[PDB]
Structure 1
Amino acid sequence: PLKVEKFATANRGNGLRAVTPLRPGELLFRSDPLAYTVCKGSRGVVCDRCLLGKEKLMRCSQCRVAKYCSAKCQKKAWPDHKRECKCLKSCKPRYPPDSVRLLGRVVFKLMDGAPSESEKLYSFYDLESNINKLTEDKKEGLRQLVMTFQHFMREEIQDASQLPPAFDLFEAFAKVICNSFTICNAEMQEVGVGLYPSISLLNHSCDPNCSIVFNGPHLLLRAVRDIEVGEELTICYLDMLMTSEERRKQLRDQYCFECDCFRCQTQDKDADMLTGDEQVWKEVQESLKKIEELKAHWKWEQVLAMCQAIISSNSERLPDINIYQLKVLDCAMDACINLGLLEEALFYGTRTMEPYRIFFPGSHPVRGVQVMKVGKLQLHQGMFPQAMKNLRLAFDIMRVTHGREHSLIEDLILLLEECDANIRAS
C-alpha cells in the first residue's frame, strides 16, 4: 500500500518516485529511525528518548550520560541504550562526536536488533557513501572517526566478529555523514540526529515537492504540492535561508554534488537575501556563528544579549529581509520566549513574517511553525483578530506540511477554538 517506489535515476543514483498522482498534504511515508541520538548541545537538556526539553530530567544510573523525562522513556529507550551505556560510562569525561554515538547505535541495532521497518525501501548497506568523490581531507576526517569509534566502542566491541559481516567502519562513517537527518525542535535548535534509510532515497531540490517533519524521533514524509505519476520525489537538504553560493558549498562539502536546479541556475532570491551594506551583514554573519553556538547549547540569556546588540546596535543596521538579520531576529524571538518576554518576542516575531513569506515556499514547515508562534503570542497578549488570522494561516500551511498524524496539529486546533471563542464573546 505504498504510493512511492525506489527507482534508478539517470545521473542522480537511486531515487524515489510517485507510482500514483499525489496531492498536497498527502502522507507518503512515516518511519521511526534505524538509529538516532540526542545532539551534543542538547544532551542533558532534552530527554534521550522523546527529545523534548523538560524542566526535570534524571540521569541513567550506570552511565550518568543519558537523561530521561520519565520511567516510560527510559524503558522504551533501554534496548537502544543498553550496550552504549557501558561505552559512555568507560569513556568519561570524554564524550564522543554525534556521528560516533550514532554509528554505535547502528552497529548495536544491526547486531542485536530485529529487522527495522525503517529499512523497508532501502537499507543501511544500500546507502550512498560517495567515497570516490571524497577529497583527501574528507577521507582523513573519516579515518579519525574510525579510530574514535574503535576507542569509544572498545568495551563492547573488541574485534570485527562483533561487527556485522560486511561492515567496513570507513564506509559506514561515509554513509552516516551523507545520510544523517537532523531532528529540530520548534526553536530551530538541532536536538537530535538519526538515520532513516528508506527516506534517504529522496534526492535534493532547492524547490522540493515534498517535506519532512519530525514528531519526536518519528518522521513524516508529505507531498507539499501536486505531483504527477512517475515524478521523482525531492526534499530540500538545507535551510531555506542560504544564498545559492552557500547552498553550493554545503551540497559540495557534505553531499558531493553540484545542484543544477532552476533556483541555483537563476540565483533565485540571492540579491534580495543580501540587501544592505555588505560590510555590515558580514559582521552580522560572523556574529551569527557565536549566537547559533550559544543557541545550540540552550543558553538563551547570552543569545538575547548578542542579538539585541545587533538589532538595537548603535552602528549601522540591516533590513529585516537580509537573511542574516532575519536569522538574528529569529534567535532573539526564541530567546525572548524562553526568557519569558512575550512583548519583545512578538515584536521580533512580527518582523520576521513578511521575510518568511518571501523566502519560504508556499507550504513549508518552518514557516508554518513561525506563523503559529506569532499567532500564539498574539493570542496570549489578547489580540484576537490578529491571532486568528495567523493561526488560520498556520493551519493552512501545517495541514499540508504536518497533518493530522502530527501532534502539533491537535495543539493548533485547540488554539483556533480558543481564539474563536474569544472573538465570539466580543
Structure 2
Amino acid sequence: PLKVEKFATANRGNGLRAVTPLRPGELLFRSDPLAYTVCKGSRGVVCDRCLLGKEKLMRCSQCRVAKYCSAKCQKKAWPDHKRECKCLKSCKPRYPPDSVRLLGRVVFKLMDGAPSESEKLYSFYDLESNINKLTEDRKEGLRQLVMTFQHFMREEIQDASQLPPAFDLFEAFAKVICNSFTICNAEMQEVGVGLYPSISLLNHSCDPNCSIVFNGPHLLLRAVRDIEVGEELTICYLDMLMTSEERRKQLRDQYCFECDCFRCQTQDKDADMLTGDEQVWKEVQESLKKIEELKAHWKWEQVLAMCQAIISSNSERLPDINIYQLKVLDCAMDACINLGLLEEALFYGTRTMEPYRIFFPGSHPVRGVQVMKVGKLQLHQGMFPQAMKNLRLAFDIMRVTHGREHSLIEDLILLLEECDANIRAS
C-alpha cells in the first residue's frame, strides 16, 4: 500500500501528494534508476555499476571506457552495457556528453528490458518536456544533442524501428533536461546521473517537505516534515547555497518555471549569503568554477592549493557565512579528508558548522553528512565529548534524511557506539 499518489496540480503539472499523514523520516518510495551512468569527472574513478570508489578499477576490455570495482560489478553491468559498449568503442577517442550516454541507456532499457519498477507511478513516456516553453537557444542545443546521439549510437540504432514506438529524440532530450537526477555518493560527492521517472513526479520547493538521498544508484525518498493527507510532496531541486537570483536563473534555464514561494518573494537569506566585500566574493565565485571542476575530477591536491590561497589569503577575506567562502571551506575540508590531512580538515569543517546550521534548516542530508564528517574527525583525534555531541546531531538529522535503509546510518551507529564506549571508559 503506497503512502503517495500521483495527481494533477492546479498550476505545476502533475505532482505527488500524501495518501496518509506522514512524519519526518518516513520512507515514502524507493527506486533503482530506469537508466544511469557515471558522470564525466568520476568516469574511471568510481565503479560504473555501483558508483563506489576503489584504488584500482578493472576496465571493459572491449570498449575500455566502462570501469568496475569487481568482477561481480563488471559481469552484472554487462546486460545494460552490452549495446553501448559497441558504440563507445566505435567512437573510441570521442566521449559523448553525459546526457547522450544516459539516453542511450534509456533506449536500450525500453527496447530490451522488462517494464521497470522505476516507472511504477510515472514513465519516461509521461515525463514533462516543457517543449512549449523552450527558448530558441535551448532548442538549438537540443538539436545538437540529437545529432550527437545519432552519431554515437549509429552502430546500434539506425532507424526508428530500433527506438520505442513514436519515440522522438528531440522530445526525449527535452525530458532529460528537466528530469535528470544527480547521483551523489555517501560523502555527497556527485558521481552520476540517472532517470527515476516515478520520483520525477515531485515538484520543487525552496523549502521542501521531502528529501531524496542516494545509496549507490538506489534512491530513497523520505518525508522531512509532518505532512497532511492530500498535501503536495516537494523536494528542493537545487543546492541550498544559492541566492534567490541564482535559483531563478537555474529554475528558468533548466526547468522552465518561475518560483512564487515565500523564500523567493522575500529574498530569504540572500543578504546574509552575500556578506563581505563584493569584489572579493566575486573573485572567489569566479575561482570556484575551476575549484569545482577540479573537485568533480577528484583532483584533491589541486583543490586544496586553490582553496588555501583563498582561506589563508594575504589579501582581503570573507566571512564564513558568505556562500562562496563556505563552498571553498567545504571543498578544502573534503580535499583534506581525502588527502589524510585530518587536523586541517577539522579546522575547515568546524568553521562550516554554524553556516550549515543556518542554510540547511530542519533535516537536510547535506548537513547531516557534514556534521557526521566533523564528528568523525573529532572522534579520531580523541575529542570524545565534542565528537559525541556532533555524532548525535548527525544521527538526529540522518535518522530523518537517510534512515535505516541507508547503509551510511549503520556506519554512523558504529561511530556512536565507539565514541560512547570511549566516554564510558573513564
Moved segments of 4+, more than 6 Å = none
- Report the secondary structure of 2:252's partner residue: helix
Query: Is the 2:186–2:408 contact (alpha carbons within 8 Å) kept by the matching residues of 1?
Result: no
Q: CA deviation at 1:56?
A: 1.5
* Offset from partner CA, 1:385-415 (integer Å, 9 cap, x none): 0100000000000000000000000000000
Q: CA deviation at 1:242?
A: 0.2
Q: CA deviation at 1:71?
A: 1.0
Counterparts of 1:342 and 1:63, CA distance in 2: 39
Counterparts of 1:186 and 1:315, CA distance in 2: 35
Counterparts of 2:185 and 2:309, CA distance in 1: 25
* Offset from partner CA, 1:302-357 (integer Å, 9 cap, x none): 00000000000000000000000000000000000111100000000000000000
Counterparts of 2:166 and 2:425, CA distance in 1: 67
Counterparts of 1:209 and 1:362, CA distance in 2: 10
* Offset from partner CA, 1:215-258 (integer Å, 9 cap, x none): 00000000001001100000000000000000000000000000
* Offset from partner CA, 1:101-148 (integer Å, 9 cap, x none): 000000000000000000000000000000100000000000000000
* Offset from partner CA, 1:271-306 (integer Å, 9 cap, x none): 000000111100000000010000011100000000
Q: CA deviation at 1:186?
A: 4.2
- Report the secondary structure of 1:212's partner residue: strand
- Report the secondary structure of 2:41's partner residue: coil
Matched, 1:409 2:403: no
Q: CA deviation at 1:185?
A: 2.3
Q: CA deviation at 1:60?
A: 0.6
**Number of residues of Structure 1 aligned to a counterpart in Structure 2:** 426
Counterparts of 2:67 and 2:381, CA distance in 1: 35
Change (3 A) 1:376 1:358: same
- Report the secondary structure of 1:183's partner residue: strand
- Greater shift, 67-76 or 35-44, is seen at 67-76
- Report the secondary structure of 1:382's partner residue: coil
- Report the secondary structure of 2:357's partner residue: helix
TM-score by length of 1: 0.99
Counterparts of 1:239 and 1:2, CA distance in 2: 29
Counterparts of 1:123 and 1:298, CA distance in 2: 34
Query: Is the 2:23–2:225 contact (alpha carbons within 8 Å) kept by the matching residues of 1?
Result: yes
Counterparts of 2:246 and 2:76, CA distance in 1: 40
Q: CA deviation at 1:188?
A: 3.9
Counterparts of 1:393 and 1:79, CA distance in 2: 42
- Report the secondary structure of 1:307's partner residue: helix
* Offset from partner CA, 1:248-271 (integer Å, 9 cap, x none): 000000000000011111111000
Query: Is the 2:104–2:153 contact (alpha carbons within 8 Å) kept by the matching residues of 1?
Result: yes
Counterparts of 1:89 and 1:382, CA distance in 2: 51
Q: CA deviation at 1:75?
A: 1.9
- Report the secondary structure of 1:298's partner residue: coil
Counterparts of 2:424 and 2:153, CA distance in 1: 61
Q: CA deviation at 1:189?
A: 2.9
- Report the secondary structure of 2:42's partner residue: coil
Counterparts of 1:189 and 1:92, CA distance in 2: 28
TM-score by length of 2: 0.99
Query: Is the 2:185–2:215 contact (alpha carbons within 8 Å) kept by the matching residues of 1?
Result: no
Counterparts of 1:380 and 1:90, CA distance in 2: 49
- Report the secondary structure of 1:83's partner residue: helix
Structure 2: where are the runs of 5+ without partners?
none
* Offset from partner CA, 1:366-391 (integer Å, 9 cap, x none): 00000000000001111100100000
Matched, 1:179 2:179: yes
Identical counterparts, % of pairs: 100
Query: Is the 2:130–2:256 contact (alpha carbons within 8 Å) kept by the matching residues of 1?
Result: yes
* Offset from partner CA, 1:68-105 (integer Å, 9 cap, x none): 00111112211111110111111110000000000000
Counterparts of 1:241 and 1:62, CA distance in 2: 42
- Report the secondary structure of 2:228's partner residue: coil
Q: CA deviation at 1:187?
A: 4.3
* Offset from partner CA, 1:171-202 (integer Å, 9 cap, x none): 00000111000011244431000000000000
Counterparts of 1:88 and 1:380, CA distance in 2: 44
- Greater shift, 137-146 or 51-60, is seen at 51-60
CA RMSD, 1 decimal: 0.6
